[PDB]
From Swiss-Prot, chain A:
Keywords: Disulfide bond, Glycoprotein, Golgi apparatus, Membrane, Signal-anchor, Transferase, Transmembrane, Transmembrane helix. It catalyses: L-tyrosyl-[protein] + 3'-phosphoadenylyl sulfate = O-sulfo-L-tyrosine-[protein] + adenosine 3',5'-bisphosphate + H(+). Residues 41-45 are annotated as: Interaction with peptide substrate. Homodimer. Can also form heterodimers with TPST1. It is found in: Golgi apparatus membrane. Substrate peptides must be flexible in order to adopt an L-shaped conformation in the deep binding cleft. GO terms for biological process: 3'-phosphoadenosine 5'-phosphosulfate metabolic process; fusion of sperm to egg plasma membrane involved in single fertilization; peptidyl-tyrosine sulfation; prevention of polyspermy. The record marks K88, S215 as: Transition state stabilizer. Residues 1-282 are lumenal. Disulfide bonds join C36-C86, C155-C163. One of its GO terms (molecular function) is protein-tyrosine sulfotransferase activity. It comes from Homo sapiens (Human). The chain holds residues 61 to 352 of 377 of the full protein. This is Protein-tyrosine sulfotransferase 2. GO terms for cellular component: endoplasmic reticulum; Golgi apparatus; Golgi lumen; Golgi membrane; trans-Golgi network.
Length: 282, 285
Protein backbone atom coordinates (compact mmCIF):
# COMPACT_ATOMS: atom_id res chain seq x y z
CA UNK A 1 0.00 0.00 0.00
CA UNK A 2 1.90 3.05 -1.36
CA UNK A 3 0.82 6.62 -0.61
CA UNK A 4 1.69 9.54 -2.87
CA UNK A 5 1.37 13.26 -2.30
CA UNK A 6 2.65 16.76 -3.00
CA UNK A 7 5.29 16.47 -0.25
CA UNK A 8 6.81 13.06 -1.00
CA UNK A 9 10.51 12.48 -1.78
CA UNK A 10 10.87 12.59 -5.55
CA UNK A 11 13.79 12.30 -7.89
CA UNK A 12 14.13 14.09 -11.16
CA UNK A 13 16.92 13.04 -13.44
CA UNK A 14 17.81 15.12 -16.49
CA UNK A 15 20.20 17.17 -18.63
CA UNK A 16 20.75 17.43 -22.38
CA UNK A 17 19.89 14.22 -24.24
CA UNK A 18 22.70 11.75 -24.87
CA UNK A 19 24.00 12.67 -21.39
CA UNK A 20 23.68 9.13 -20.08
CA UNK A 21 20.42 10.14 -18.44
CA UNK A 22 18.79 6.76 -19.31
CA UNK A 23 21.86 5.17 -17.76
CA UNK A 24 21.47 7.34 -14.67
CA UNK A 25 17.84 6.50 -14.07
CA UNK A 26 18.20 2.81 -14.96
CA UNK A 27 20.53 2.30 -11.98
CA UNK A 28 17.98 3.97 -9.74
CA UNK A 29 15.09 1.76 -11.05
CA UNK A 30 17.13 -1.32 -10.15
CA UNK A 31 17.12 -0.10 -6.53
CA UNK A 32 14.17 -1.87 -4.89
CA UNK A 33 12.96 1.24 -3.05
CA UNK A 34 13.04 3.21 -6.30
CA UNK A 35 11.40 3.46 -9.69
CA UNK A 36 11.94 6.04 -12.46
CA UNK A 37 10.63 4.18 -15.48
CA UNK A 38 10.83 5.55 -19.01
CA UNK A 39 10.65 9.08 -20.44
CA UNK A 40 7.11 10.45 -20.18
CA UNK A 41 7.27 13.05 -23.01
CA UNK A 42 4.19 14.56 -21.50
CA UNK A 43 5.63 16.15 -18.40
CA UNK A 44 8.01 18.46 -20.28
CA UNK A 45 5.25 19.17 -22.76
CA UNK A 46 2.83 20.37 -20.07
CA UNK A 47 5.60 22.39 -18.45
CA UNK A 48 6.49 24.04 -21.79
CA UNK A 49 2.89 25.29 -22.02
CA UNK A 50 2.96 26.04 -18.25
CA UNK A 51 5.88 28.33 -18.81
CA UNK A 52 4.01 29.92 -21.73
CA UNK A 53 0.88 31.16 -19.85
CA UNK A 54 2.85 33.02 -17.18
CA UNK A 55 -9.31 37.89 -13.98
CA UNK A 56 -10.56 34.33 -14.63
CA UNK A 57 -9.64 33.43 -11.01
CA UNK A 58 -6.90 31.30 -12.62
CA UNK A 59 -4.11 32.58 -10.31
CA UNK A 60 -0.56 31.19 -10.02
CA UNK A 61 -1.71 29.13 -6.98
CA UNK A 62 -4.33 27.28 -9.05
CA UNK A 63 -2.15 26.53 -12.10
CA UNK A 64 0.51 25.18 -9.77
CA UNK A 65 -2.03 23.16 -7.77
CA UNK A 66 -3.21 21.79 -11.11
CA UNK A 67 0.36 21.10 -12.22
CA UNK A 68 1.22 19.23 -8.99
CA UNK A 69 -1.72 16.92 -9.32
CA UNK A 70 -1.15 16.45 -13.06
CA UNK A 71 2.48 15.48 -12.75
CA UNK A 72 2.00 13.38 -9.57
CA UNK A 73 -0.50 11.14 -11.34
CA UNK A 74 1.66 10.59 -14.41
CA UNK A 75 4.75 9.50 -12.45
CA UNK A 76 2.69 7.53 -9.92
CA UNK A 77 0.71 5.71 -12.58
CA UNK A 78 2.94 5.39 -15.63
CA UNK A 79 5.02 2.63 -14.00
CA UNK A 80 5.24 -0.01 -11.23
CA UNK A 81 4.85 1.39 -7.69
CA UNK A 82 7.62 2.00 -5.13
CA UNK A 83 8.38 3.88 -1.88
CA UNK A 84 10.61 6.48 -3.65
CA UNK A 85 9.41 7.74 -7.00
CA UNK A 86 11.54 9.20 -9.70
CA UNK A 87 11.12 10.58 -13.22
CA UNK A 88 13.46 10.96 -16.16
CA UNK A 89 12.69 13.42 -18.94
CA UNK A 90 15.76 15.29 -20.14
CA UNK A 91 14.29 18.78 -20.51
CA UNK A 92 12.50 18.87 -17.15
CA UNK A 93 15.66 20.12 -15.52
CA UNK A 94 14.88 23.28 -17.48
CA UNK A 95 12.09 24.13 -15.08
CA UNK A 96 13.66 22.69 -11.96
CA UNK A 97 13.43 25.94 -9.93
CA UNK A 98 9.68 25.79 -10.49
CA UNK A 99 9.61 22.02 -9.88
CA UNK A 100 11.26 22.57 -6.49
CA UNK A 101 8.58 25.01 -5.44
CA UNK A 102 5.84 22.52 -6.37
CA UNK A 103 7.41 19.53 -4.62
CA UNK A 104 9.48 21.00 -1.74
CA UNK A 105 11.02 17.58 -1.02
CA UNK A 106 11.97 16.58 -4.53
CA UNK A 107 15.65 16.32 -5.45
CA UNK A 108 17.45 16.77 -8.73
CA UNK A 109 20.28 15.12 -10.55
CA UNK A 110 21.67 17.02 -13.51
CA UNK A 111 23.59 14.81 -15.97
CA UNK A 112 26.68 16.59 -17.25
CA UNK A 113 28.42 14.97 -20.22
CA UNK A 114 31.14 16.36 -22.50
CA UNK A 115 28.85 18.03 -25.07
CA UNK A 116 31.36 16.85 -27.65
CA UNK A 117 30.27 13.37 -26.76
CA UNK A 118 26.60 14.44 -26.55
CA UNK A 119 26.62 16.26 -29.87
CA UNK A 120 28.57 13.53 -31.62
CA UNK A 121 26.13 10.98 -30.22
CA UNK A 122 23.06 12.84 -31.46
CA UNK A 123 24.67 13.57 -34.83
CA UNK A 124 25.79 10.04 -35.62
CA UNK A 125 22.70 8.42 -34.09
CA UNK A 126 20.21 10.76 -35.89
CA UNK A 127 18.42 11.77 -32.66
CA UNK A 128 16.19 14.74 -33.61
CA UNK A 129 15.64 17.15 -30.66
CA UNK A 130 13.95 20.55 -29.96
CA UNK A 131 15.76 22.86 -32.44
CA UNK A 132 18.96 20.80 -32.72
CA UNK A 133 19.80 20.87 -36.44
CA UNK A 134 21.71 17.64 -37.18
CA UNK A 135 23.51 19.11 -40.23
CA UNK A 136 26.04 21.29 -38.36
CA UNK A 137 28.17 20.41 -35.35
CA UNK A 138 28.52 24.20 -34.87
CA UNK A 139 24.78 24.52 -34.55
CA UNK A 140 24.42 21.55 -32.21
CA UNK A 141 27.17 22.67 -29.89
CA UNK A 142 25.95 26.23 -29.63
CA UNK A 143 22.60 24.70 -28.86
CA UNK A 144 23.91 22.20 -26.31
CA UNK A 145 25.73 25.19 -24.92
CA UNK A 146 22.70 27.41 -24.50
CA UNK A 147 20.76 24.43 -23.19
CA UNK A 148 23.21 23.28 -20.53
CA UNK A 149 23.94 26.83 -19.34
CA UNK A 150 20.32 27.25 -18.32
CA UNK A 151 19.70 23.94 -16.54
CA UNK A 152 22.91 24.59 -14.57
CA UNK A 153 21.87 28.15 -13.72
CA UNK A 154 18.65 26.60 -12.44
CA UNK A 155 20.48 23.85 -10.57
CA UNK A 156 22.70 26.51 -8.96
CA UNK A 157 19.83 28.76 -7.98
CA UNK A 158 18.17 25.62 -6.66
CA UNK A 159 21.04 24.91 -4.31
CA UNK A 160 23.63 22.26 -3.47
CA UNK A 161 21.06 20.78 -1.10
CA UNK A 162 18.46 19.90 -3.73
CA UNK A 163 20.48 19.66 -6.95
CA UNK A 164 23.49 17.49 -7.61
CA UNK A 165 25.54 17.67 -10.80
CA UNK A 166 26.45 14.26 -12.14
CA UNK A 167 29.40 13.77 -14.45
CA UNK A 168 28.71 10.96 -16.90
CA UNK A 169 32.38 10.18 -17.35
CA UNK A 170 32.97 10.26 -13.58
CA UNK A 171 30.10 7.81 -13.38
CA UNK A 172 31.31 5.47 -16.17
CA UNK A 173 34.80 5.28 -14.66
CA UNK A 174 33.95 5.18 -10.92
CA UNK A 175 30.38 3.91 -10.70
CA UNK A 176 30.84 2.57 -7.16
CA UNK A 177 32.15 5.83 -5.70
CA UNK A 178 29.61 7.78 -7.77
CA UNK A 179 26.38 6.12 -6.78
CA UNK A 180 27.41 6.10 -3.14
CA UNK A 181 27.57 9.90 -2.99
CA UNK A 182 24.49 10.20 -5.21
CA UNK A 183 22.20 8.23 -3.00
CA UNK A 184 23.89 9.99 -0.06
CA UNK A 185 22.94 13.35 -1.44
CA UNK A 186 19.60 11.66 -2.06
CA UNK A 187 19.50 10.31 1.50
CA UNK A 188 18.64 6.65 0.69
CA UNK A 189 20.27 3.51 2.18
CA UNK A 190 22.89 1.69 0.11
CA UNK A 191 22.12 -1.07 -2.38
CA UNK A 192 24.74 -2.78 -4.55
CA UNK A 193 22.07 -3.63 -7.18
CA UNK A 194 22.85 -0.23 -8.66
CA UNK A 195 25.98 -1.61 -10.24
CA UNK A 196 24.04 -4.59 -11.56
CA UNK A 197 21.27 -2.75 -13.31
CA UNK A 198 21.87 -4.91 -16.42
CA UNK A 199 20.56 -7.83 -14.40
CA UNK A 200 17.20 -6.16 -13.53
CA UNK A 201 15.61 -5.25 -16.92
CA UNK A 202 11.95 -6.22 -17.42
CA UNK A 203 12.12 -7.57 -13.90
CA UNK A 204 9.80 -6.28 -11.13
CA UNK A 205 10.98 -3.63 -8.59
CA UNK A 206 13.69 -2.99 -11.14
CA UNK A 207 14.17 -1.42 -14.53
CA UNK A 208 11.46 -0.81 -17.13
CA UNK A 209 12.69 0.00 -20.70
CA UNK A 210 11.02 1.62 -23.72
CA UNK A 211 11.89 -0.44 -26.80
CA UNK A 212 11.72 2.66 -28.99
CA UNK A 213 13.65 5.03 -26.73
CA UNK A 214 17.05 5.78 -28.26
CA UNK A 215 19.39 5.14 -25.34
CA UNK A 216 18.25 1.61 -24.86
CA UNK A 217 20.47 -0.88 -26.70
CA UNK A 218 23.40 0.68 -24.77
CA UNK A 219 21.77 0.62 -21.27
CA UNK A 220 21.08 -3.13 -21.75
CA UNK A 221 24.81 -3.67 -21.12
CA UNK A 222 26.39 -2.84 -17.73
CA UNK A 223 28.27 0.40 -17.06
CA UNK A 224 30.81 0.31 -19.91
CA UNK A 225 33.53 2.64 -21.11
CA UNK A 226 33.24 2.35 -24.90
CA UNK A 227 31.35 5.63 -25.26
CA UNK A 228 33.53 8.06 -23.26
CA UNK A 229 35.80 9.18 -26.07
CA UNK A 230 34.74 7.63 -29.40
CA UNK A 231 33.83 11.23 -30.36
CA UNK A 232 37.41 12.48 -30.65
CA UNK A 233 38.69 12.70 -34.22
CA UNK A 234 35.21 13.26 -35.71
CA UNK A 235 34.89 17.01 -35.05
CA UNK A 236 35.25 19.40 -38.03
CA UNK A 237 38.66 21.08 -37.69
CA UNK A 238 37.17 24.59 -37.76
CA UNK A 239 34.87 23.60 -34.92
CA UNK A 240 37.82 22.12 -32.98
CA UNK A 241 39.27 25.54 -33.66
CA UNK A 242 36.37 27.74 -32.51
CA UNK A 243 35.79 25.33 -29.67
CA UNK A 244 35.88 27.81 -26.73
CA UNK A 245 33.74 30.47 -28.52
CA UNK A 246 31.03 27.97 -29.49
CA UNK A 247 31.08 26.37 -26.02
CA UNK A 248 32.39 28.56 -23.15
CA UNK A 249 30.41 26.24 -20.86
CA UNK A 250 32.87 23.42 -21.56
CA UNK A 251 35.48 25.44 -19.68
CA UNK A 252 33.20 26.48 -16.80
CA UNK A 253 32.16 22.90 -16.20
CA UNK A 254 35.87 21.99 -16.20
CA UNK A 255 35.85 20.52 -19.72
CA UNK A 256 39.04 21.74 -21.42
CA UNK A 257 37.59 22.83 -24.80
CA UNK A 258 41.01 22.43 -26.47
CA UNK A 259 41.82 19.04 -24.97
CA UNK A 260 41.03 16.57 -27.72
CA UNK A 261 39.90 14.64 -25.68
CA UNK A 262 40.77 15.71 -22.12
CA UNK A 263 42.05 13.08 -19.74
CA UNK A 264 38.84 12.09 -17.96
CA UNK A 265 40.51 9.68 -15.51
CA UNK A 266 41.37 6.03 -14.89
CA UNK A 267 38.86 3.10 -14.87
CA UNK A 268 37.92 0.90 -11.86
CA UNK A 269 38.64 -2.82 -12.33
CA UNK A 270 34.88 -3.32 -12.14
CA UNK A 271 34.21 -1.26 -15.27
CA UNK A 272 37.09 -2.63 -17.29
CA UNK A 273 35.91 -6.16 -16.58
CA UNK A 274 32.40 -5.14 -17.54
CA UNK A 275 33.63 -3.62 -20.81
CA UNK A 276 35.52 -6.78 -21.55
CA UNK A 277 32.35 -8.77 -20.93
CA UNK A 278 30.68 -6.45 -23.42
CA UNK A 279 33.17 -7.18 -26.19
CA UNK A 280 32.75 -10.91 -25.59
CA UNK A 281 28.98 -10.67 -26.28
CA UNK A 282 27.38 -11.26 -22.85
CA UNK B 1 -15.78 22.07 5.01
CA UNK B 2 -16.32 21.14 1.35
CA UNK B 3 -14.80 17.99 -0.06
CA UNK B 4 -14.15 17.16 -3.68
CA UNK B 5 -13.28 14.18 -5.88
CA UNK B 6 -13.50 12.50 -9.29
CA UNK B 7 -17.08 11.38 -8.78
CA UNK B 8 -18.77 14.43 -7.31
CA UNK B 9 -21.74 16.07 -9.11
CA UNK B 10 -20.39 18.56 -11.61
CA UNK B 11 -22.19 20.95 -13.90
CA UNK B 12 -20.74 21.63 -17.27
CA UNK B 13 -22.13 24.60 -19.09
CA UNK B 14 -21.18 25.14 -22.70
CA UNK B 15 -22.20 25.76 -26.32
CA UNK B 16 -21.30 28.18 -29.13
CA UNK B 17 -20.42 31.62 -27.55
CA UNK B 18 -22.98 34.42 -27.78
CA UNK B 19 -25.59 31.76 -26.87
CA UNK B 20 -26.37 33.13 -23.37
CA UNK B 21 -24.00 30.74 -21.60
CA UNK B 22 -23.09 33.62 -19.20
CA UNK B 23 -26.72 34.12 -18.38
CA UNK B 24 -27.15 30.37 -17.87
CA UNK B 25 -24.24 30.15 -15.50
CA UNK B 26 -24.91 33.53 -13.86
CA UNK B 27 -28.29 32.24 -12.74
CA UNK B 28 -26.66 29.02 -11.53
CA UNK B 29 -24.07 30.84 -9.39
CA UNK B 30 -26.87 32.76 -7.71
CA UNK B 31 -28.04 29.48 -6.16
CA UNK B 32 -26.57 29.28 -2.62
CA UNK B 33 -25.64 25.59 -3.15
CA UNK B 34 -23.94 26.23 -6.54
CA UNK B 35 -20.82 27.94 -7.99
CA UNK B 36 -19.74 28.04 -11.66
CA UNK B 37 -17.52 31.13 -11.68
CA UNK B 38 -15.75 32.65 -14.68
CA UNK B 39 -14.41 31.04 -17.85
CA UNK B 40 -11.09 29.47 -16.86
CA UNK B 41 -9.69 29.39 -20.42
CA UNK B 42 -7.16 26.74 -19.45
CA UNK B 43 -9.30 23.61 -19.16
CA UNK B 44 -10.43 23.50 -22.75
CA UNK B 45 -6.84 24.41 -23.59
CA UNK B 46 -5.33 21.33 -21.97
CA UNK B 47 -8.10 19.11 -23.32
CA UNK B 48 -7.35 20.11 -26.87
CA UNK B 49 -3.74 19.07 -26.30
CA UNK B 50 -4.67 15.86 -24.62
CA UNK B 51 -6.93 15.31 -27.63
CA UNK B 52 -4.03 15.95 -29.97
CA UNK B 53 -1.76 13.49 -28.24
CA UNK B 54 -4.30 10.72 -28.57
CA UNK B 55 -5.35 12.16 -31.92
CA UNK B 56 -1.76 11.38 -32.93
CA UNK B 57 -0.72 8.05 -34.47
CA UNK B 58 3.01 8.01 -33.63
CA UNK B 59 3.02 9.74 -30.21
CA UNK B 60 0.39 7.36 -28.78
CA UNK B 61 2.53 4.36 -29.69
CA UNK B 62 5.29 6.25 -27.98
CA UNK B 63 3.26 7.33 -24.95
CA UNK B 64 1.77 3.89 -24.16
CA UNK B 65 5.22 2.28 -24.26
CA UNK B 66 6.39 4.74 -21.61
CA UNK B 67 3.64 3.39 -19.40
CA UNK B 68 1.72 6.61 -20.07
CA UNK B 69 -1.65 5.13 -21.10
CA UNK B 70 -5.12 6.57 -21.52
CA UNK B 71 -5.91 5.73 -17.90
CA UNK B 72 -2.95 7.71 -16.56
CA UNK B 73 -3.67 10.58 -18.93
CA UNK B 74 -7.22 10.53 -17.84
CA UNK B 75 -6.12 10.21 -14.23
CA UNK B 76 -3.98 13.28 -14.70
CA UNK B 77 -6.66 15.12 -16.61
CA UNK B 78 -9.04 14.55 -13.74
CA UNK B 79 -6.66 15.63 -11.00
CA UNK B 80 -5.78 18.64 -13.09
CA UNK B 81 -9.24 19.81 -14.12
CA UNK B 82 -10.50 19.15 -10.63
CA UNK B 83 -8.07 21.44 -8.91
CA UNK B 84 -8.84 24.32 -11.23
CA UNK B 85 -12.55 23.92 -10.70
CA UNK B 86 -12.10 23.49 -6.96
CA UNK B 87 -9.84 26.45 -6.44
CA UNK B 88 -10.63 29.15 -9.00
CA UNK B 89 -13.71 30.50 -7.17
CA UNK B 90 -15.65 30.36 -3.90
CA UNK B 91 -16.26 26.93 -2.36
CA UNK B 92 -19.69 25.40 -3.07
CA UNK B 93 -21.61 22.15 -2.46
CA UNK B 94 -22.19 21.67 -6.18
CA UNK B 95 -19.48 22.90 -8.45
CA UNK B 96 -19.98 24.01 -12.00
CA UNK B 97 -17.84 25.42 -14.80
CA UNK B 98 -18.45 27.47 -17.92
CA UNK B 99 -16.08 27.44 -20.92
CA UNK B 100 -17.97 27.40 -24.26
CA UNK B 101 -16.01 24.75 -26.21
CA UNK B 102 -15.77 22.34 -23.25
CA UNK B 103 -18.98 20.77 -24.55
CA UNK B 104 -17.04 19.65 -27.66
CA UNK B 105 -15.57 16.83 -25.55
CA UNK B 106 -18.46 15.97 -23.17
CA UNK B 107 -18.25 12.30 -24.26
CA UNK B 108 -14.79 12.23 -22.77
CA UNK B 109 -15.73 14.58 -19.89
CA UNK B 110 -18.51 12.27 -18.78
CA UNK B 111 -16.05 9.38 -18.79
CA UNK B 112 -13.85 11.48 -16.52
CA UNK B 113 -16.60 12.57 -14.15
CA UNK B 114 -19.19 9.81 -13.94
CA UNK B 115 -21.65 12.04 -12.08
CA UNK B 116 -21.16 15.23 -14.03
CA UNK B 117 -24.06 16.84 -15.84
CA UNK B 118 -24.07 18.89 -19.05
CA UNK B 119 -26.20 21.87 -20.21
CA UNK B 120 -25.96 22.54 -23.97
CA UNK B 121 -27.11 26.16 -24.56
CA UNK B 122 -28.91 26.33 -27.93
CA UNK B 123 -29.47 29.81 -29.43
CA UNK B 124 -30.60 30.37 -33.01
CA UNK B 125 -27.34 30.82 -34.95
CA UNK B 126 -28.55 33.97 -36.70
CA UNK B 127 -28.65 35.79 -33.28
CA UNK B 128 -25.26 34.43 -32.16
CA UNK B 129 -23.45 35.07 -35.54
CA UNK B 130 -24.84 38.59 -35.50
CA UNK B 131 -23.97 39.07 -31.83
CA UNK B 132 -20.41 37.85 -32.54
CA UNK B 133 -20.04 39.91 -35.76
CA UNK B 134 -21.36 43.19 -34.29
CA UNK B 135 -19.67 43.01 -30.86
CA UNK B 136 -13.08 32.83 -31.43
CA UNK B 137 -10.76 29.92 -32.42
CA UNK B 138 -12.13 28.72 -35.78
CA UNK B 139 -14.31 31.71 -36.86
CA UNK B 140 -13.86 34.51 -39.59
CA UNK B 141 -14.30 38.30 -38.89
CA UNK B 142 -15.64 39.51 -42.31
CA UNK B 143 -18.32 37.03 -43.53
CA UNK B 144 -21.83 36.13 -42.31
CA UNK B 145 -21.71 33.16 -44.69
CA UNK B 146 -18.49 31.92 -43.00
CA UNK B 147 -19.68 32.67 -39.40
CA UNK B 148 -22.84 30.61 -39.82
CA UNK B 149 -21.34 27.59 -41.67
CA UNK B 150 -18.92 27.57 -38.71
CA UNK B 151 -21.58 28.03 -36.03
CA UNK B 152 -23.18 25.15 -37.94
CA UNK B 153 -20.26 22.73 -37.91
CA UNK B 154 -19.59 23.61 -34.21
CA UNK B 155 -23.15 23.13 -32.93
CA UNK B 156 -23.49 19.97 -35.10
CA UNK B 157 -20.67 18.35 -33.07
CA UNK B 158 -21.70 19.41 -29.52
CA UNK B 159 -25.20 18.04 -30.13
CA UNK B 160 -24.06 14.62 -31.46
CA UNK B 161 -21.88 14.55 -28.35
CA UNK B 162 -24.83 15.59 -26.15
CA UNK B 163 -26.88 12.89 -27.93
CA UNK B 164 -24.46 10.01 -27.55
CA UNK B 165 -24.04 11.24 -23.95
CA UNK B 166 -27.71 10.52 -23.21
CA UNK B 167 -30.76 12.57 -22.25
CA UNK B 168 -29.96 11.64 -18.67
CA UNK B 169 -26.55 13.30 -18.64
CA UNK B 170 -27.07 15.97 -21.29
CA UNK B 171 -29.87 18.55 -21.57
CA UNK B 172 -30.29 20.96 -24.53
CA UNK B 173 -31.29 24.35 -23.02
CA UNK B 174 -33.05 26.76 -25.43
CA UNK B 175 -31.99 30.40 -24.99
CA UNK B 176 -35.23 31.85 -26.27
CA UNK B 177 -37.23 29.46 -24.08
CA UNK B 178 -35.08 30.37 -21.07
CA UNK B 179 -35.32 34.12 -21.62
CA UNK B 180 -39.08 33.87 -22.41
CA UNK B 181 -39.90 31.39 -19.65
CA UNK B 182 -37.24 31.76 -16.91
CA UNK B 183 -39.27 30.10 -14.12
CA UNK B 184 -40.31 27.18 -16.40
CA UNK B 185 -36.80 26.48 -17.77
CA UNK B 186 -35.09 26.73 -14.33
CA UNK B 187 -37.65 24.40 -12.83
CA UNK B 188 -36.96 21.82 -15.60
CA UNK B 189 -33.20 22.29 -15.22
CA UNK B 190 -32.80 21.97 -11.38
CA UNK B 191 -35.04 18.94 -11.83
CA UNK B 192 -32.78 17.30 -14.46
CA UNK B 193 -29.85 18.25 -12.24
CA UNK B 194 -31.66 16.96 -9.17
CA UNK B 195 -30.98 20.23 -7.38
CA UNK B 196 -33.48 21.68 -4.91
CA UNK B 197 -35.27 24.78 -6.15
CA UNK B 198 -34.24 28.10 -4.65
CA UNK B 199 -35.84 31.42 -5.48
CA UNK B 200 -32.47 33.22 -5.76
CA UNK B 201 -32.26 31.75 -9.32
CA UNK B 202 -34.64 34.30 -10.91
CA UNK B 203 -33.05 37.20 -8.99
CA UNK B 204 -29.47 36.77 -10.29
CA UNK B 205 -28.94 40.49 -10.94
CA UNK B 206 -29.11 41.18 -7.18
CA UNK B 207 -26.27 38.74 -6.32
CA UNK B 208 -23.25 39.83 -8.50
CA UNK B 209 -20.05 40.10 -6.43
CA UNK B 210 -22.08 38.84 -3.43
CA UNK B 211 -20.93 35.73 -1.39
CA UNK B 212 -22.43 32.31 -2.39
CA UNK B 213 -23.59 33.89 -5.67
CA UNK B 214 -22.37 35.38 -8.99
CA UNK B 215 -18.67 36.09 -9.55
CA UNK B 216 -17.82 37.91 -12.81
CA UNK B 217 -14.74 38.92 -14.85
CA UNK B 218 -14.73 42.64 -15.81
CA UNK B 219 -13.12 41.80 -19.22
CA UNK B 220 -15.45 38.96 -20.42
CA UNK B 221 -17.57 40.02 -23.44
CA UNK B 222 -25.69 39.64 -17.78
CA UNK B 223 -25.59 42.50 -15.20
CA UNK B 224 -29.33 43.08 -15.93
CA UNK B 225 -32.17 40.61 -15.05
CA UNK B 226 -33.76 38.29 -17.67
CA UNK B 227 -34.60 40.83 -20.52
CA UNK B 228 -36.27 40.34 -23.98
CA UNK B 229 -33.95 42.72 -25.88
CA UNK B 230 -31.44 40.33 -27.49
CA UNK B 231 -34.07 37.89 -28.95
CA UNK B 232 -34.92 39.07 -32.50
CA UNK B 233 -32.59 42.08 -32.96
CA UNK B 234 -30.58 40.04 -35.50
CA UNK B 235 -33.38 40.08 -38.12
CA UNK B 236 -32.98 42.61 -40.95
CA UNK B 237 -29.21 42.83 -40.73
CA UNK B 238 -28.58 39.60 -42.67
CA UNK B 239 -27.20 39.98 -46.23
CA UNK B 240 -30.19 38.96 -48.42
CA UNK B 241 -28.03 36.32 -50.19
CA UNK B 242 -27.18 34.56 -46.89
CA UNK B 243 -30.93 34.76 -46.03
CA UNK B 244 -31.56 33.08 -49.42
CA UNK B 245 -29.07 30.23 -48.99
CA UNK B 246 -30.06 29.82 -45.30
CA UNK B 247 -31.01 26.13 -45.36
CA UNK B 248 -27.75 24.99 -47.02
CA UNK B 249 -25.43 27.13 -44.80
CA UNK B 250 -27.10 25.82 -41.63
CA UNK B 251 -29.23 22.61 -42.04
CA UNK B 252 -28.82 22.47 -38.23
CA UNK B 253 -31.25 25.30 -37.49
CA UNK B 254 -33.94 23.07 -39.13
CA UNK B 255 -33.25 19.89 -37.09
CA UNK B 256 -32.75 21.94 -33.85
CA UNK B 257 -36.28 23.24 -34.40
CA UNK B 258 -35.32 26.56 -35.98
CA UNK B 259 -37.12 27.53 -39.20
CA UNK B 260 -34.32 28.68 -41.63
CA UNK B 261 -37.02 30.42 -43.68
CA UNK B 262 -38.90 32.16 -40.86
CA UNK B 263 -37.29 35.62 -40.44
CA UNK B 264 -37.58 35.37 -37.48
CA UNK B 265 -39.39 32.20 -36.44
CA UNK B 266 -42.07 32.98 -33.83
CA UNK B 267 -40.21 32.04 -30.67
CA UNK B 268 -43.17 32.39 -28.26
CA UNK B 269 -44.77 34.74 -25.70
CA UNK B 270 -43.05 36.35 -22.66
CA UNK B 271 -43.89 35.77 -19.00
CA UNK B 272 -45.31 38.89 -17.30
CA UNK B 273 -42.13 38.45 -15.18
CA UNK B 274 -39.73 38.90 -18.19
CA UNK B 275 -41.69 41.92 -19.58
CA UNK B 276 -41.55 43.79 -16.19
CA UNK B 277 -37.85 42.92 -16.22
CA UNK B 278 -37.47 44.35 -19.79
CA UNK B 279 -39.30 47.48 -18.49
CA UNK B 280 -37.07 48.14 -15.36
CA UNK B 281 -33.97 47.82 -17.64
CA UNK B 282 -35.29 50.40 -20.21
CA UNK B 283 -35.99 52.66 -17.15
CA UNK B 284 -32.39 52.35 -15.85
CA UNK B 285 -32.51 50.01 -12.82
N1 LIG C 1 25.53 0.90 -19.60
C1 LIG C 1 26.06 2.02 -20.16
N2 LIG C 1 27.37 2.41 -20.03
C2 LIG C 1 27.89 3.54 -20.60
N3 LIG C 1 27.12 4.36 -21.33
C3 LIG C 1 25.80 4.10 -21.53
C4 LIG C 1 25.19 2.89 -20.94
N4 LIG C 1 23.90 2.86 -21.28
C5 LIG C 1 23.68 3.96 -22.05
N5 LIG C 1 24.81 4.69 -22.19
C6 LIG C 1 24.94 5.96 -22.93
O1 LIG C 1 23.74 6.72 -22.90
C7 LIG C 1 24.10 7.77 -23.79
C8 LIG C 1 22.87 8.53 -24.22
O2 LIG C 1 22.42 9.22 -23.07
P1 LIG C 1 20.86 9.42 -22.84
O3 LIG C 1 20.75 8.23 -21.89
O4 LIG C 1 20.73 10.79 -22.20
O5 LIG C 1 20.20 9.39 -24.22
C9 LIG C 1 24.77 7.07 -24.96
O6 LIG C 1 25.89 7.83 -25.38
P2 LIG C 1 26.59 7.41 -26.77
O7 LIG C 1 25.41 7.53 -27.72
O8 LIG C 1 27.73 8.38 -27.02
O9 LIG C 1 27.15 6.00 -26.55
C10 LIG C 1 25.17 5.72 -24.39
O10 LIG C 1 26.55 5.40 -24.58
N1 LIG D 1 -29.99 39.46 -18.39
C1 LIG D 1 -29.99 39.01 -19.67
N2 LIG D 1 -31.15 38.86 -20.37
C2 LIG D 1 -31.16 38.41 -21.64
N3 LIG D 1 -30.04 38.09 -22.32
C3 LIG D 1 -28.79 38.18 -21.74
C4 LIG D 1 -28.69 38.66 -20.34
N4 LIG D 1 -27.37 38.67 -20.01
C5 LIG D 1 -26.67 38.23 -21.10
N5 LIG D 1 -27.51 37.92 -22.13
C6 LIG D 1 -27.12 37.44 -23.52
O1 LIG D 1 -26.08 36.44 -23.62
C7 LIG D 1 -25.42 36.62 -24.90
C8 LIG D 1 -23.95 36.33 -24.65
O2 LIG D 1 -23.98 35.10 -23.94
P1 LIG D 1 -22.71 34.10 -23.97
O3 LIG D 1 -22.24 34.17 -22.53
O4 LIG D 1 -23.32 32.77 -24.38
O5 LIG D 1 -21.70 34.70 -24.95
C9 LIG D 1 -25.71 38.03 -25.45
O6 LIG D 1 -26.24 38.04 -26.80
P2 LIG D 1 -26.24 39.35 -27.82
O7 LIG D 1 -24.76 39.58 -28.11
O8 LIG D 1 -27.11 39.05 -29.06
O9 LIG D 1 -26.88 40.45 -26.98
C10 LIG D 1 -26.67 38.62 -24.40
O10 LIG D 1 -27.80 39.30 -24.97
Amino acid sequence: VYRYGKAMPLIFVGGVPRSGTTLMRAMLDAHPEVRCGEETRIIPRVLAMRQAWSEAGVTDEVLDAAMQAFILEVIAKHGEPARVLCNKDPFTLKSSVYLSRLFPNSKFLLMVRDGRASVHSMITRKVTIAGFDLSSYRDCLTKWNKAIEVMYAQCMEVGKEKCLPVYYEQLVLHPRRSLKLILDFLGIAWSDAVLHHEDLIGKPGGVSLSKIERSTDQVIKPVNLEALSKWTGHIPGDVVRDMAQIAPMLAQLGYDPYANPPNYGNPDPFVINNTQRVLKGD
